Design a binder for this molecule. Structure first.
Ligand SMILES: COc1cc(=O)n(C)c2c(OC[C@@H](O)C(C)(C)O)cccc12
Ligand SMILES: COc1cc(=O)n(C)c2c(OC[C@@H](O)C(C)(C)O)cccc12
Ligand code: PRO
Ligand code: PRO
Ligand SMILES: [Zn+2]
Ligand SMILES: [Zn+2]
Ligand SMILES: [Zn+2]
Ligand SMILES: [Zn+2]
Lengths: 339, 352
């Protein structure tokens, strides 16, 4: 009698019908696979707004104990949950030609070195009687199979609408599911701290820019990105918003992203100071969240399970009490307000 | 500095960026033209859900005194307001090739019969900030039907019958209005979602029915096509097709519609089984009908949804359920409102 999603044949239509059924009161959906089940209570994420090149993308969350998240756009749908501490994404594109391009893209690195457990890290999901309907990627198993070299860092009455204006770097190709996952992880990292949804509602937008980094250097790239915003007339009057140059790859010495530390404050934001750069590749979730953290004043953390750890860890939440205080204050929150 | 929309150059991006910024608290937008101004307070319609072939379409309403409505999908955006009693729509498609096809489609009948004040009934809006292709089209439906001299259609015998025919819920019931594009038919997204928006709003306007139901419209293609121009024979086959369709098994308790762009024999705008829905007795795909989706006849799907919910032909020419096509979109008949609200689980004790 309960609704369910079969991960052995999950398509865009499967996720789209289920997620489009979720009312304001939430919906119970059972995630089904071979040797797997999970009843989740899905609800619409009504805090975050997303447009990718003017295309509305919706977010859905399960309960805290479900570790499940969803992304639903008109052309793609994503299911991301945690199973034995590993992140598993099911990415389904609506158009047959696009799903094949996406499946080819995600399958290519494994085609070089055949894996002992390829099906556990990456698998093409097929229709129940050929073209794939979705792809399954266990990020944690994939990074172990691919032997990927290390990428890292160095060094109110109504909530306020803050725009996170993402700009696809000139010459870059970013993938919709990949970009909106970095965005979903960024907003959720923020709303998890001190009940910040009462203070801010993040609106992510994505456009293309004529600006491209003049070299592989990330410091020179961000300096140039900030300077390009100040000279861009399409950004005149938006100097008080958050900005990100997004690309698929990384910068020199495998830098995942960069940003100006403590560059945003709901009352002092100006001169496009609150800007950064980020990769959007699926194998490194939480990079945009980590940079959005630095932009909101968060410092490098001592806990290896913290999002703001000095090194890249795959964790997506702020665990540091000092960082949570700094971030929430920058968004207008005070200790007297509570959580 | 309030936000505003210039109707002298309104594009998809213009409507999309404005409607996409509307928060849960609503937004004040000024509609600007050559001297005309209207401040409207837009808010998202959170009662109705719409997917057209799995593409999400959102609705926005102004205040009651604004007479303004919006439709926002990924590929098109619509603004529909009233000015001096006439219904004006601004239809903007996102893709250049699609906007040009749409502009050509809407302009074509006006080239056959060239009017002096064509600009009043129909106009291609161009990029003033400059441009070469249209960014949207303006259609004053009431002036267009007068210019085109469209042969009138009426709901004369638009219903058939069958010889068989508690408390306010914690959450209103989700009722799906499953629309199926007839085989061989081409329906236009803006046109279809306008018939749907007018159908849901006709329902929520009666006895505070949003507390009892939340309508969810979906659109798919069906292999069924009417075997003749007859509407009674068409609806009989449509209902039968549903019973023999396995993709509809377990959904016999929902509302159904065969949709097309044109009309049936003797210019019938649509048809449906009278008093075919009830939140507690709905079954066997009884609550089904057929409807045109052409822009020049707004309210046909609402009129048929009315018939499905038990509404009879009204006597007031300003009523939605009047037997002749009038262009009004609301039930004014006290008896029809009682019949419709009762079928959706409402009682006099509950109030409005
Ligand atoms: C090249 O960059 C941009 C490209 C582009 O198309 N636009 C419009 C930009 C932009 O618009 C304001 C936008 O966020 C609002 C608040 C209206 O929703 C802001 C910042 C940059 C751009
Ligand atoms: C031609 O008939 C149909 C064609 C078609 O593609 N489908 C899937 C239909 C259908 O889907 C269930 C739908 O309402 C839910 C509840 C999932 O949103 C229901 C009824 C009919 C169809
Ligand atoms: O996922 C879907 O809905 C369809 C079928 C396979 C490719 N596109
Ligand atoms: O809408 C899009 O996704 C295309 C791809 C590059 C930028 N514009
Ligand atoms: Zn860092
Ligand atoms: Zn981990
Ligand atoms: Zn995690
Ligand atoms: Zn009638």
């Amino acid at each position: 009698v309960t609704a369910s999603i079969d991960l052995q044949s999950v398509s865009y239509t499967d996720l789209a019908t289920q997620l489009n059924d979720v009312s304001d009161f939430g919906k119970m959906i059972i995630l089904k696979d071979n040797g797997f089940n999970r009843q989740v209570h899905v609800s619409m994420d009504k805090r975050t707004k997303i447009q990718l090149d003017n295309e509305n993308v919706r977010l859905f969350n399960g309960r805290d104990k479900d570790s499940t998240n969803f992304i639903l756009g008109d052309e793609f749908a994503v299911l991301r949950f945690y199973r034995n501490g590993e992140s598993i994404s099911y990415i389904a594109y609506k158009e047959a030609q696009m799903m094949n391009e996406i499946a080819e893209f995600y399958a290519a690195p494994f085609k070089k070195t055949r894996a002992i457990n390829e099906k556990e890290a990456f698998e093409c999901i097929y229709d129940s009687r050929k073209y794939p309907v979705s792809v399954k990627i266990n990020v944690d198993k994939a990074k172990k199979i691919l032997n990927l070299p290390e990428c890292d860092y160095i060094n109110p009455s109504e909530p306020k609408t803050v725009y996170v204006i993402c700009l696809r770097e000139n010459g870059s190709t970013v993938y919709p599911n990949e970009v909106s996952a970095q965005m979903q992880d960024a907003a959720n990292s923020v709303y998890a701290v001190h009940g910040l949804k009462r203070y801010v509602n993040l609106h992510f937008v994505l456009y293309t820019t004529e600006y491209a980094c003049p070299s592989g250097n990330a410091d020179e790239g961000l300096d140039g990105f900030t300077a390009s915003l100040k000279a861009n007339p399409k950004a005149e009057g938006y100097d008080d918003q958050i900005y990100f140059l997004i690309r698929w790859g990384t910068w020199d010495n495998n830098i995942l992203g960069i940003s100006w530390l403590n560059s945003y404050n709901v009352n002092t934001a100006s001169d496009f100071k609150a800007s950064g750069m980020s990769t959007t590749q699926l194998m490194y979730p939480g990079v945009m969240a980590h940079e959005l953290g630095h932009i909101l004043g968060a410092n490098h953390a001592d806990d290896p399970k913290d999002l703001m750890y000095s090194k890249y860890t795959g964790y997506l939440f702020h665990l540091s009490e000092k960082n949570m205080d700094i971030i929430a204050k920058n968004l207008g929150w005070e200790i007297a307000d509570g959580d």
